[PDB]
Design a protein around this ligand. Sequence first.
Ligand SMILES: [Zn+2]
Ligand SMILES: [Zn+2]
Length: 61
Amino acid sequence: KDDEATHCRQCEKEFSISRRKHHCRNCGHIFCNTCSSNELALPSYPKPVRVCDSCHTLLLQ
Ligand SMILES: [Zn+2]
Ligand SMILES: [Zn+2]
């Protein structure tokens, strides 16, 4: 659960009309699409949800 971000938490590029904001369902931070291209089954959720690369790696171990 998080709002008001300016840059992608991961690659740090700046969000704008040309760069959509997305949420990682595992850590709640805001990421650009390129840094959150994976979906995986996450306990609190019914269908696979979007996660950032870090969380993706964390949960695949
Ligand atoms: Zn990014
Ligand atoms: Zn995350």
